[PDB]
Amino acid sequence: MNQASVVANQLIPINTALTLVMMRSEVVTPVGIPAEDIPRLVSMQVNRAVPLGTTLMPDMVKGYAA
DSSP states (O other): OOOOEEEESSOBOTTOBOOGGGEEEEOOSSOOSBGGGHHHHTTOBBSSOBOTTOBOOGGGBTTOOO
């Protein structure tokens, strides 16, 4: 209950460096990268196109580890 994940606020194209305008948060299931990790994600690249409204998962971000 109430646990938020990072959700794409825009289509995020492949190999694009994440910016704050790209990353909303929402309480969804399954649970993705926690919202609190957004600062860590800024400037990291996604390794695939991430459609609008997709929950961002650990395997979608180059080099990401919690």
